[PDB]
Amino acid sequence: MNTVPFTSAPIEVTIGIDQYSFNVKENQPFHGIKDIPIGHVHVIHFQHADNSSMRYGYWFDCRMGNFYIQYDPKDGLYKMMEERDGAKFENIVHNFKERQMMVSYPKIDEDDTWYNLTEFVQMDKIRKIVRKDENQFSYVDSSMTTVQENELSDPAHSLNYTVINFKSREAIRPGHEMEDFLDKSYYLNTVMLQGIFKNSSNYFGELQFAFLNAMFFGNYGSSLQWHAMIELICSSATVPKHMLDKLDEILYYQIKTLPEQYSDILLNERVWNICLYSSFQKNSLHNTEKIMENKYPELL
């Protein structure tokens, strides 16, 4: 169990850790988050009380280093930093725990939600989507645009998700125009799985990371990417059976976790109705279809 200490909390802020969240008052004696489960990536995220715009945060894995948060009054945000002196870090954390100035990561034992949302998500892949190679952790916020959005403007601050485009030469083989447009199996299995991602685990990891950035930061390009990756699978007649069963589980937990009040913006009516009722895979997503119909029947 690892710890992310805070130097201080100089501005009033709602702090998220994974799917949990806590309100911290201005200059409240808050010094961080303890008992963070080892073995998973995590995200710590922020919404200032005075600017409910710009949700922002940091993806990290405590196995990769000792990380802490410190407010920067010049740039006006809570920044993640790495402490390279392990003795200084242990000593700081031990004092803060002894003074009981940390919140405990509040996981219920039965609860597998976070594992189920991050099963295929790896820090090393996050860091290739979010390029800032001098840090071990990755910053994301509500406004960052994706590489594909930039093609339709600052490249250093972009989300380099894999570009998917159903009306593209990459997606359509000369002479198989109609076949490849109506059945995307070629594009899924040869171009994306075999060619770009190498395996379905990496595909699922990027899909899961895109969803989580959409949910936690309202990142619109991430929502586009999540739906595109779902639609590519649902629109393929030929999908490995284990991939479909895993996709059903992935989406089920994403739909289960989504705020009820955010379904209007975070769910694309067309994609979901196509995927669940029109597509090749309309009969392959039993758990997802059941929770969608009981939780968001209006959308459908």
Partner: protein, 237 residues
Amino acid sequence: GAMNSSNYAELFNNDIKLFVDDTNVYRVTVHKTFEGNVATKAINGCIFTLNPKTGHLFLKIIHTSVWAGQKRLSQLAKWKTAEEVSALVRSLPKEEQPKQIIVTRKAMLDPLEVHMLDFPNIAIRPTELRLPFSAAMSIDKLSDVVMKATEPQMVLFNIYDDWLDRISSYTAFSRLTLLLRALKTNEESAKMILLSDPTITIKSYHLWPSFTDEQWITIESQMRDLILTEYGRKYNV
């Protein structure tokens, strides 16, 4: 974006463009089987691809053999249309290729877009105009060449005959669409109008009769009369 009454003179500027109409590509007769079920029999069809500025018509005849052993033919017909239009463009010299292709039905947009990915600079556009190109098979010489075809074939026409020697392309297109709208609303009456006087003939190299300017005004008036009557009939007004 979409083509409508507001940007109508764009059709007659000097950027090459084509209309593509697919309404006569997949044609069938519906009939009863011996067992009393219903079946279709396909008949020859055609793609109607028209340069509205010049009158040049690229009539690709669609022989029924292209449907043999195929499923979902109304869907295939859209992709076959797009394949053939794309092949036509590729066959034209670069300076003859269109800058825009306007499809008369929105369901042709994605098929044509996908087939034309190699041509990112050719704009594929829908239209809000209700153009009467489906009536092209009411033009006797076009109907005749489609029904006689024993194999796939492209036949080139000028759908304006020699009109551009005397009128502008805006006016020629207006006359064409008036003639076709008439043929579409009441083919028999429209065809009576055009041929009643046996001293006006169709030249061997033309599609329509050799009317003088004055006779075209009369003809055009008779076509507008036809269309309005039918409209009162249709709608009891």
